[PDB]
Amino acid sequence: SAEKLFTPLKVGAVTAPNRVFMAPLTRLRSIEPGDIPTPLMGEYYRQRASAGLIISEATQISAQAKGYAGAPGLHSPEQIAAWKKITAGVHAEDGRIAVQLWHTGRISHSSIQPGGQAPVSASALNANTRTSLRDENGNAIRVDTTTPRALELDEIPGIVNDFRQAVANAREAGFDLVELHSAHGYLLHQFLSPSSNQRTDQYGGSVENRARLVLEVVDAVCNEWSADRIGIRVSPIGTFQNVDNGPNEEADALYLIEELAKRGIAYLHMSETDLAGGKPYSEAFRQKVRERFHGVIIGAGAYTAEKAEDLIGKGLIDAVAFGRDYIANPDLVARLQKKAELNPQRPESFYGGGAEGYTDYPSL
Ligand SMILES: Cc1cc2nc3c(=O)[nH]c(=O)nc-3n(C[C@H](O)[C@H](O)[C@H](O)COP(=O)(O)O)c2cc1C
Ligand SMILES: C[C@]12C=CC(=O)C=C1CC[C@@H]1[C@@H]2CC[C@]2(C)C(=O)CC[C@@H]12
């Protein structure tokens, strides 16, 4: 029956009935041209509406933000209209959903950028990894990332504004909250990490400079909507998609969190490790984070229900976001509550394709 995973939690402007959240999961099944959400995607989210909180797959704040074929956007009328149906479906089932907004930065390819030009980032350094495009038959394919163009100083205000606008669109689209994707090596993290940021202006160098952009974004969206509607996901400890967190990751992470706390935002979502290995968070560190943020804290990364109960019981985190278990178990809440077995995962269909391996996993 579990001790606390199934107890309500106030998350900013809304209230989750349980602490089992669905982590943001890129599935690359949107319509192109237009990067438009689909009815199928609506069904997928609706099947998982019993989650304490649904965090959508990463969504573009602009066309320039696009880095993967099939990923949705929230910048055009068509996209807004499609998302409105998806949030309505979730609400029809009494669920809550937040839209994760990102700008992929250097984790992109020129073929899917506006005008077919090079993607942008903090510096002109290749991410040295690959992204997902679609072939002539619409099938997902891996391709090496394009070397980025360093953003000009006078272009940064435009970036902040795209985030601001997307949040405004998210509000009209019916989303309950918004989660800024400031992790996993995407644009915001590109600026935060010294390994990917070699700028010599006020957006590079010190942690204060490196964190400038993300903080300007946080202030802009808090002003556009409301601080209790804002969430942010970070992955400040370890290495992700080739972007590490610098020689003083812990101290830099604590600085960022204290700054975020000043805005009084809804929640802090901590992605502890990427899909590959990663040194685990020490309780000492969890305590330092805990005492610096006064909003909800969500833990994530290969979590087990037992680990969730342990850390929530110790009062270190408030909720847990499950990724892969949610892909395969729409009614994960009921299964964890009843201690039932889960459906096996089918990794080959995580990205692209159709209903198979998407709205395919049965509920109890
Ligand atoms: C197919 C797939 C897509 C993902 N897409 C995103 C994404 O868009 N944004 C994000 O922040 N994390 C993303 N993640 C990371 C997950 O949110 C999560 O942190 C990760 O899967 C670890 O949790 P798990 O062990 O419970 O699956 C993705 C993971 C998978 C497996
Ligand atoms: C899991 C992930 C990580 C962090 C994040 O924020 C969002 C995603 C979704 C896309 C995958 C990426 C990891 C790298 C992947 C597997 C590739 O090489 C192609 C598809 C990518």
Short mmCIF file of C-alpha atoms and ligand atoms in Angstrom, two decimals:
data_model
loop_
_atom_site.label_atom_id
_atom_site.label_comp_id
_atom_site.label_asym_id
_atom_site.label_seq_id
_atom_site.Cartn_x
_atom_site.Cartn_y
_atom_site.Cartn_z
CA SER A 1 0.00 0.00 0.00
CA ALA A 2 3.06 2.24 0.42
CA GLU A 3 3.35 4.93 3.10
CA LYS A 4 3.26 8.29 1.30
CA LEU A 5 3.52 7.91 -2.48
CA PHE A 6 -0.27 8.00 -2.59
CA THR A 7 -0.86 11.10 -0.48
CA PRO A 8 -1.78 14.55 -1.89
CA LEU A 9 0.79 17.26 -2.51
CA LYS A 10 0.28 20.95 -3.25
CA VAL A 11 2.31 21.80 -6.37
CA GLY A 12 2.17 25.51 -7.04
CA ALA A 13 -1.28 26.44 -8.36
CA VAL A 14 -2.56 22.85 -8.38
CA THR A 15 -2.90 19.88 -6.07
CA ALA A 16 -1.70 16.41 -7.02
CA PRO A 17 -3.59 13.49 -5.39
CA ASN A 18 -0.45 11.34 -5.34
CA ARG A 19 3.32 11.79 -5.66
CA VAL A 20 3.84 9.46 -8.61
CA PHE A 21 4.59 11.72 -11.56
CA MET A 22 5.08 10.97 -15.23
CA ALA A 23 8.49 12.30 -16.30
CA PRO A 24 8.81 14.28 -19.55
CA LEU A 25 9.26 11.72 -22.35
CA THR A 26 10.16 12.62 -25.93
CA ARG A 27 8.32 10.15 -28.21
CA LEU A 28 8.81 11.82 -31.61
CA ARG A 29 5.36 11.07 -33.00
CA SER A 30 4.20 14.58 -33.91
CA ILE A 31 2.98 15.60 -37.37
CA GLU A 32 5.38 17.20 -39.85
CA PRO A 33 5.19 19.72 -41.41
CA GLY A 34 4.10 21.82 -38.44
CA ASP A 35 5.41 19.71 -35.53
CA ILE A 36 1.76 19.31 -34.55
CA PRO A 37 0.50 17.20 -31.62
CA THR A 38 -1.84 14.39 -32.68
CA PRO A 39 -5.07 12.74 -31.55
CA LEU A 40 -2.94 9.65 -30.90
CA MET A 41 -0.74 11.69 -28.55
CA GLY A 42 -3.94 12.88 -26.89
CA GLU A 43 -4.99 9.29 -26.24
CA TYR A 44 -1.52 8.46 -24.87
CA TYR A 45 -1.66 11.24 -22.28
CA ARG A 46 -5.29 10.55 -21.45
CA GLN A 47 -4.42 6.93 -20.62
CA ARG A 48 -1.96 8.21 -18.02
CA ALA A 49 -4.17 10.89 -16.46
CA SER A 50 -4.18 9.21 -13.03
CA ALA A 51 -0.59 10.38 -12.48
CA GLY A 52 -0.15 12.92 -9.70
CA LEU A 53 1.16 15.17 -12.44
CA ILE A 54 1.88 14.58 -16.11
CA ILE A 55 4.94 16.36 -17.48
CA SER A 56 4.76 16.42 -21.28
CA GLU A 57 7.48 15.46 -23.73
CA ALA A 58 9.91 18.32 -24.45
CA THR A 59 8.14 20.93 -26.62
CA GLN A 60 9.65 23.67 -28.84
CA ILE A 61 9.26 27.29 -27.74
CA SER A 62 10.00 28.24 -31.36
CA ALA A 63 10.93 26.73 -34.73
CA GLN A 64 14.59 27.52 -34.04
CA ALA A 65 14.29 25.47 -30.83
CA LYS A 66 13.65 22.32 -32.89
CA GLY A 67 16.34 19.66 -32.73
CA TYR A 68 14.42 16.43 -33.39
CA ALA A 69 12.02 15.46 -36.16
CA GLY A 70 8.70 14.52 -34.59
CA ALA A 71 9.04 16.66 -31.45
CA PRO A 72 6.10 19.06 -30.93
CA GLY A 73 6.08 22.83 -30.69
CA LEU A 74 3.96 25.38 -28.83
CA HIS A 75 4.60 28.47 -30.94
CA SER A 76 2.06 28.24 -33.80
CA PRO A 77 -1.77 28.49 -33.91
CA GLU A 78 -2.05 24.92 -35.19
CA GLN A 79 0.12 23.65 -32.33
CA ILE A 80 -1.84 25.60 -29.71
CA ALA A 81 -5.13 24.21 -31.02
CA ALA A 82 -3.82 20.63 -30.95
CA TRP A 83 -2.45 20.98 -27.41
CA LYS A 84 -5.79 22.43 -26.26
CA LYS A 85 -7.44 19.12 -27.14
CA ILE A 86 -4.76 17.15 -25.32
CA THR A 87 -4.96 19.10 -22.07
CA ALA A 88 -8.77 18.92 -22.27
CA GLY A 89 -8.56 15.15 -22.59
CA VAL A 90 -6.38 14.93 -19.49
CA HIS A 91 -8.67 17.26 -17.55
CA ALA A 92 -11.72 15.28 -18.65
CA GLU A 93 -10.12 12.46 -16.67
CA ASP A 94 -9.40 14.77 -13.73
CA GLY A 95 -5.66 14.85 -14.34
CA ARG A 96 -3.04 17.59 -14.29
CA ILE A 97 -0.48 18.25 -17.02
CA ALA A 98 2.54 20.49 -17.39
CA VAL A 99 4.27 21.25 -20.67
CA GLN A 100 8.06 20.92 -20.70
CA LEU A 101 9.47 23.68 -22.88
CA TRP A 102 12.92 23.52 -24.45
CA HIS A 103 15.29 24.93 -27.01
CA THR A 104 17.65 22.15 -28.10
CA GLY A 105 20.48 24.51 -28.96
CA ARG A 106 23.43 22.57 -30.41
CA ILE A 107 21.66 19.20 -30.08
CA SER A 108 20.08 19.76 -33.49
CA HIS A 109 20.70 19.49 -37.24
CA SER A 110 20.67 22.15 -39.96
CA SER A 111 18.14 20.22 -42.08
CA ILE A 112 15.38 20.88 -39.55
CA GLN A 113 16.36 24.45 -38.65
CA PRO A 114 14.67 27.48 -40.24
CA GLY A 115 16.19 28.15 -43.65
CA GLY A 116 18.25 25.00 -43.18
CA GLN A 117 20.93 26.97 -41.36
CA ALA A 118 23.15 25.95 -38.46
CA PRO A 119 21.55 25.66 -35.00
CA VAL A 120 22.54 28.06 -32.22
CA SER A 121 24.22 27.67 -28.84
CA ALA A 122 26.33 29.49 -26.26
CA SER A 123 29.47 28.80 -28.32
CA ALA A 124 30.40 27.39 -31.73
CA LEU A 125 31.23 23.91 -30.41
CA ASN A 126 29.74 20.68 -31.82
CA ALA A 127 27.77 18.62 -29.29
CA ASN A 128 29.59 15.58 -30.68
CA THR A 129 26.51 13.41 -30.37
CA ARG A 130 23.52 12.63 -32.55
CA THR A 131 19.87 13.61 -32.80
CA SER A 132 16.80 12.05 -34.38
CA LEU A 133 15.48 12.92 -37.82
CA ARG A 134 13.04 11.01 -40.00
CA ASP A 135 13.81 9.32 -43.32
CA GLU A 136 11.88 9.56 -46.59
CA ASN A 137 9.39 7.09 -45.13
CA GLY A 138 8.84 8.97 -41.90
CA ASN A 139 10.89 6.52 -39.84
CA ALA A 140 13.14 7.79 -37.03
CA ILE A 141 16.88 7.83 -37.78
CA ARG A 142 20.04 8.91 -35.91
CA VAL A 143 22.22 11.63 -37.42
CA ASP A 144 25.33 13.43 -36.14
CA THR A 145 24.61 16.90 -34.70
CA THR A 146 25.47 20.03 -36.71
CA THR A 147 28.18 22.36 -35.40
CA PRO A 148 26.38 25.37 -33.85
CA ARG A 149 26.66 29.10 -34.41
CA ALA A 150 27.41 31.08 -31.24
CA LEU A 151 24.49 33.32 -30.31
CA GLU A 152 25.17 37.04 -30.73
CA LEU A 153 24.78 39.16 -27.60
CA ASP A 154 21.80 41.01 -29.09
CA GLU A 155 20.08 37.69 -29.85
CA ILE A 156 19.72 36.61 -26.21
CA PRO A 157 16.76 38.92 -25.52
CA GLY A 158 14.97 37.13 -28.36
CA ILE A 159 15.61 33.76 -26.71
CA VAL A 160 14.16 34.96 -23.41
CA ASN A 161 11.15 36.31 -25.29
CA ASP A 162 10.48 33.03 -27.08
CA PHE A 163 10.32 31.32 -23.68
CA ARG A 164 8.01 34.08 -22.44
CA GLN A 165 5.70 33.72 -25.44
CA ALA A 166 5.59 29.93 -25.23
CA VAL A 167 4.53 30.14 -21.58
CA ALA A 168 1.79 32.56 -22.59
CA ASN A 169 0.72 30.04 -25.26
CA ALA A 170 0.90 27.21 -22.71
CA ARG A 171 -1.55 29.14 -20.53
CA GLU A 172 -4.09 29.49 -23.33
CA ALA A 173 -3.53 25.87 -24.35
CA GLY A 174 -4.88 24.77 -20.97
CA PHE A 175 -1.70 23.50 -19.31
CA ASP A 176 -1.70 23.58 -15.51
CA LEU A 177 2.02 24.27 -15.20
CA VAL A 178 5.12 24.74 -17.30
CA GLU A 179 8.52 23.11 -16.79
CA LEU A 180 11.60 24.84 -18.21
CA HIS A 181 14.03 22.29 -19.66
CA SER A 182 17.28 23.53 -18.13
CA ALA A 183 18.92 20.11 -18.21
CA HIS A 184 20.36 17.28 -20.30
CA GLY A 185 22.67 19.44 -22.40
CA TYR A 186 20.05 21.50 -24.19
CA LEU A 187 20.29 25.29 -24.69
CA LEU A 188 19.85 26.43 -21.09
CA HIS A 189 22.25 23.76 -19.82
CA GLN A 190 24.64 24.68 -22.64
CA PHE A 191 24.97 28.12 -21.07
CA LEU A 192 25.15 26.75 -17.51
CA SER A 193 28.04 24.36 -18.20
CA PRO A 194 31.57 25.74 -18.66
CA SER A 195 32.40 22.78 -20.91
CA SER A 196 29.91 24.04 -23.49
CA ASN A 197 30.10 27.76 -22.68
CA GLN A 198 33.29 29.61 -23.65
CA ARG A 199 31.71 33.07 -24.01
CA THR A 200 33.65 36.12 -22.88
CA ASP A 201 30.65 38.38 -22.30
CA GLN A 202 28.33 38.52 -19.28
CA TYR A 203 26.83 35.14 -20.26
CA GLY A 204 30.04 33.18 -19.88
CA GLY A 205 32.69 32.65 -17.24
CA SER A 206 31.55 32.77 -13.62
CA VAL A 207 28.62 30.72 -12.40
CA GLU A 208 26.74 34.01 -12.02
CA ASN A 209 27.34 34.66 -15.72
CA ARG A 210 26.64 31.09 -16.80
CA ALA A 211 23.33 31.08 -14.89
CA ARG A 212 22.31 34.51 -16.18
CA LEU A 213 20.27 33.26 -19.13
CA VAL A 214 18.22 30.65 -17.29
CA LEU A 215 17.47 33.14 -14.51
CA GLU A 216 16.38 35.80 -17.02
CA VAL A 217 14.05 33.19 -18.51
CA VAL A 218 12.66 32.25 -15.10
CA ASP A 219 11.99 35.92 -14.32
CA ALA A 220 10.38 36.47 -17.72
CA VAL A 221 7.96 33.55 -17.43
CA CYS A 222 7.12 34.25 -13.79
CA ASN A 223 6.16 37.75 -14.90
CA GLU A 224 4.23 36.51 -17.95
CA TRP A 225 2.08 34.06 -15.97
CA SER A 226 2.75 33.42 -12.28
CA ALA A 227 5.57 31.93 -10.21
CA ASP A 228 3.27 29.21 -8.87
CA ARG A 229 2.76 28.00 -12.45
CA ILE A 230 6.49 27.59 -13.08
CA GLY A 231 8.64 24.50 -12.73
CA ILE A 232 12.21 23.88 -13.87
CA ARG A 233 14.17 20.70 -14.54
CA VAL A 234 17.92 20.64 -13.99
CA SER A 235 20.61 17.93 -14.10
CA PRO A 236 23.42 19.82 -12.24
CA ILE A 237 25.41 16.79 -11.04
CA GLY A 238 27.25 14.46 -13.41
CA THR A 239 27.61 14.29 -17.19
CA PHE A 240 24.75 14.34 -19.72
CA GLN A 241 24.89 14.20 -23.52
CA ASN A 242 28.59 15.11 -23.28
CA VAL A 243 27.89 18.25 -21.25
CA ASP A 244 29.39 18.01 -17.76
CA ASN A 245 28.72 20.49 -14.96
CA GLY A 246 32.22 21.83 -14.38
CA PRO A 247 34.92 21.39 -11.68
CA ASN A 248 32.65 22.86 -9.00
CA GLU A 249 29.32 21.29 -9.94
CA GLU A 250 27.95 21.04 -6.38
CA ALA A 251 28.74 24.64 -5.39
CA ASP A 252 27.44 25.93 -8.74
CA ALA A 253 24.29 23.85 -8.37
CA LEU A 254 23.60 25.28 -4.90
CA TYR A 255 24.04 28.82 -6.23
CA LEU A 256 21.53 28.18 -9.01
CA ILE A 257 19.01 26.69 -6.59
CA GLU A 258 19.24 29.58 -4.13
CA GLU A 259 18.60 31.99 -7.00
CA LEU A 260 15.65 29.93 -8.23
CA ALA A 261 14.27 29.92 -4.69
CA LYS A 262 14.12 33.71 -4.72
CA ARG A 263 11.50 33.57 -7.47
CA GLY A 264 9.28 31.33 -5.34
CA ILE A 265 8.51 29.02 -8.26
CA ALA A 266 6.28 25.95 -8.11
CA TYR A 267 8.91 23.23 -8.21
CA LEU A 268 12.48 22.05 -8.69
CA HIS A 269 12.80 18.88 -10.79
CA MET A 270 16.14 17.11 -10.29
CA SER A 271 17.26 14.67 -12.99
CA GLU A 272 19.89 12.79 -10.99
CA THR A 273 21.50 10.73 -13.76
CA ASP A 274 21.23 10.28 -17.51
CA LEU A 275 20.23 6.90 -18.95
CA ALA A 276 23.83 5.72 -18.50
CA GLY A 277 25.82 5.53 -15.28
CA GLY A 278 26.05 8.32 -12.72
CA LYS A 279 27.30 8.87 -9.17
CA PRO A 280 24.28 8.93 -6.81
CA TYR A 281 23.28 11.95 -4.75
CA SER A 282 24.59 11.83 -1.19
CA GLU A 283 22.04 12.56 1.52
CA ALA A 284 24.29 15.43 2.56
CA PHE A 285 23.82 17.04 -0.85
CA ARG A 286 20.09 16.29 -0.84
CA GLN A 287 19.95 18.15 2.49
CA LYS A 288 21.76 21.19 1.13
CA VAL A 289 19.36 21.31 -1.82
CA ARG A 290 16.37 20.70 0.46
CA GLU A 291 17.14 23.63 2.76
CA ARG A 292 17.69 26.01 -0.17
CA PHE A 293 14.41 25.49 -2.05
CA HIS A 294 11.03 26.08 -0.41
CA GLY A 295 8.81 24.70 -3.15
CA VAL A 296 8.13 21.13 -4.25
CA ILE A 297 11.17 19.02 -5.12
CA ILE A 298 10.85 16.17 -7.61
CA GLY A 299 13.45 13.40 -7.75
CA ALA A 300 14.09 11.44 -10.97
CA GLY A 301 16.41 8.90 -12.55
CA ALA A 302 16.03 5.11 -12.39
CA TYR A 303 13.93 5.48 -9.25
CA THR A 304 12.24 2.51 -7.61
CA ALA A 305 9.04 2.86 -5.59
CA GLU A 306 11.07 1.88 -2.52
CA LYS A 307 13.64 4.63 -3.08
CA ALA A 308 10.82 7.14 -3.53
CA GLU A 309 9.22 6.18 -0.22
CA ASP A 310 12.61 6.30 1.47
CA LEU A 311 13.55 9.81 0.35
CA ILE A 312 10.03 11.22 0.72
CA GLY A 313 9.87 9.68 4.19
CA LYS A 314 13.18 11.31 5.09
CA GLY A 315 11.63 14.56 3.91
CA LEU A 316 14.33 15.11 1.28
CA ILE A 317 12.06 15.18 -1.77
CA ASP A 318 8.29 15.49 -2.22
CA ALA A 319 7.53 13.52 -5.36
CA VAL A 320 9.11 11.22 -7.92
CA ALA A 321 8.86 11.33 -11.70
CA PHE A 322 9.01 7.94 -13.41
CA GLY A 323 9.98 7.78 -17.06
CA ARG A 324 10.27 4.36 -18.66
CA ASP A 325 7.83 2.76 -16.22
CA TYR A 326 5.24 5.28 -17.36
CA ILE A 327 5.89 4.54 -21.02
CA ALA A 328 4.91 0.93 -20.38
CA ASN A 329 2.30 1.40 -17.63
CA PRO A 330 -0.45 3.98 -18.15
CA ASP A 331 -1.98 3.04 -14.79
CA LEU A 332 1.36 2.97 -12.99
CA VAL A 333 -0.29 4.61 -9.97
CA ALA A 334 -2.73 1.73 -9.47
CA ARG A 335 -0.04 -0.89 -10.06
CA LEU A 336 2.38 0.61 -7.54
CA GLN A 337 -0.52 1.03 -5.12
CA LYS A 338 -1.66 -2.57 -5.50
CA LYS A 339 1.92 -3.84 -5.78
CA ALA A 340 1.01 -5.44 -9.11
CA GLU A 341 3.47 -6.47 -11.81
CA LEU A 342 4.30 -4.01 -14.58
CA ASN A 343 4.13 -4.48 -18.35
CA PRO A 344 7.55 -5.20 -19.88
CA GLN A 345 9.24 -2.35 -21.73
CA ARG A 346 9.69 -2.32 -25.51
CA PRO A 347 12.64 0.10 -26.03
CA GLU A 348 12.60 -0.22 -29.84
CA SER A 349 9.37 1.79 -30.00
CA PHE A 350 10.26 4.57 -27.55
CA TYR A 351 10.97 6.90 -30.49
CA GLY A 352 8.87 7.48 -33.59
CA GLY A 353 6.38 5.13 -35.19
CA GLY A 354 2.72 4.96 -34.32
CA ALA A 355 0.35 3.42 -31.80
CA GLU A 356 2.47 0.30 -31.39
CA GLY A 357 4.59 0.74 -28.26
CA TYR A 358 2.74 3.94 -27.41
CA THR A 359 -0.97 3.52 -26.60
CA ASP A 360 -0.20 -0.21 -26.73
CA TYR A 361 0.53 -1.03 -23.09
CA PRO A 362 -2.64 -2.22 -21.33
CA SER A 363 -3.93 -0.99 -17.98
CA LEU A 364 -5.05 -3.34 -15.22
C1 LIG B 1 12.38 7.70 -24.67
C2 LIG B 1 12.77 8.73 -23.63
C3 LIG B 1 12.50 10.12 -23.87
C4 LIG B 1 12.86 11.10 -22.87
N1 LIG B 1 12.56 12.41 -23.13
C5 LIG B 1 12.86 13.40 -22.22
C6 LIG B 1 12.52 14.80 -22.49
O1 LIG B 1 11.95 15.27 -23.47
N2 LIG B 1 12.90 15.74 -21.49
C7 LIG B 1 13.56 15.34 -20.30
O2 LIG B 1 13.81 16.20 -19.55
N3 LIG B 1 13.85 14.08 -20.07
C8 LIG B 1 13.54 13.09 -20.95
N4 LIG B 1 13.85 11.74 -20.69
C9 LIG B 1 14.45 11.43 -19.42
C10 LIG B 1 13.28 10.99 -18.52
O3 LIG B 1 12.42 12.06 -18.14
C11 LIG B 1 13.82 10.34 -17.23
O4 LIG B 1 14.52 11.34 -16.43
C12 LIG B 1 14.68 9.12 -17.45
O5 LIG B 1 14.01 8.18 -18.33
C13 LIG B 1 15.11 8.39 -16.20
O6 LIG B 1 13.96 7.91 -15.50
P1 LIG B 1 13.49 6.40 -15.55
O7 LIG B 1 14.62 5.54 -15.06
O8 LIG B 1 12.32 6.40 -14.51
O9 LIG B 1 13.03 6.05 -16.93
C14 LIG B 1 13.50 10.72 -21.64
C15 LIG B 1 13.77 9.24 -21.46
C16 LIG B 1 13.41 8.31 -22.41
C17 LIG B 1 13.77 6.86 -22.04
C1 LIG B 2 16.49 10.71 -23.42
C2 LIG B 2 16.99 12.11 -23.99
C3 LIG B 2 17.84 12.71 -22.87
C4 LIG B 2 17.54 13.87 -22.26
C5 LIG B 2 16.33 14.65 -22.65
O1 LIG B 2 16.03 15.72 -22.11
C6 LIG B 2 15.50 14.12 -23.72
C7 LIG B 2 15.76 12.95 -24.37
C8 LIG B 2 14.86 12.44 -25.46
C9 LIG B 2 15.72 12.13 -26.72
C10 LIG B 2 16.89 11.29 -26.47
C11 LIG B 2 17.84 11.90 -25.31
C12 LIG B 2 19.04 11.06 -25.11
C13 LIG B 2 19.84 10.87 -26.45
C14 LIG B 2 18.96 10.14 -27.47
C15 LIG B 2 18.58 8.67 -27.00
C16 LIG B 2 19.59 9.96 -28.86
O2 LIG B 2 20.69 9.74 -29.11
C17 LIG B 2 18.37 10.13 -29.84
C18 LIG B 2 17.08 10.41 -29.03
C19 LIG B 2 17.75 11.03 -27.75
#
